[PDB]
Amino acid sequence: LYIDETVNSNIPTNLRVLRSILENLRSKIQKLESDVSAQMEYCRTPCTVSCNIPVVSGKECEEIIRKGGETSEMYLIQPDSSVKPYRVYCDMNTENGGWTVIQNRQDGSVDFGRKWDPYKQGFGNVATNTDGKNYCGLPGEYWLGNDKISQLTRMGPTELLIEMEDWKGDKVKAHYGGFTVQNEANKYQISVNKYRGTAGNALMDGASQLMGENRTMTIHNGMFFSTYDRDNDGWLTSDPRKQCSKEDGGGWWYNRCHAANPNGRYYWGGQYTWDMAKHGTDDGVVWMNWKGSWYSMRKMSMKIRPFF
């Protein structure tokens, strides 16, 4: 039969679409090339930051405050005689005051998709200037050395505060009067208990948006620390491609894979779909429990302090 006439009618219209879509991409692309080239030129000159180290010092932040540390700027601590004092950022305001910030996000200023060592050593900017003022009172995203973090906790009872907020302002947080990460020799485990506060016990009770085997497989508590440079997830598979850390770019105490992904991919706006994730998963700092698997926070922080 005579069905041929549809060729001159159908094919063309598609040709028009492909032309639009394809041509739109070529320019869209040349657009990015200009940016990458340009941004590249900028990193030929790093940022300068000057932080006058306060005289007051101690082991953690708790000691400092009880030592005349009222202002909330970066300090210099030393939790042990056999370790070099390092910089850090002490929050002396939030709830009682005297919390030792261990990790923080707020603008994606520093990528957290680093290898294992960086996470062991520590990376990011402890703190930046305060609009002219010689000292550094502003934060800036980072992750102090694991070994330190472990060493910190493994020397007295400790607790944690994981505040955060969306792009609506609304804030929430978690509280564990019992935090402890093991030494590098033990893949930096993480034994957290004693939940509190409102935001979601997505660190020991798994995710709320799941049930049974699905949920109980998202409990960070007692897991090991993994990086796309070294796999220690609860995801047992042979495909090198399939690993929590590679999926959701970044080091964390993954477990097939997370109920909360701090240290993820700081996205903008706050929302995002699967067809944007680097791998197609749901990377990026998201608590999920308070918001959902598709929503990276505007600010994510963690801080420690003794139990007493």
Binding site: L210, E213, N214, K242, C244, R256, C257, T281
Partner: peptide
């Protein structure tokens, strides 16, 4: 984002 069986 979990990984089913």
């Amino acid at each position: 984002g979990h990984r089913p069986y």
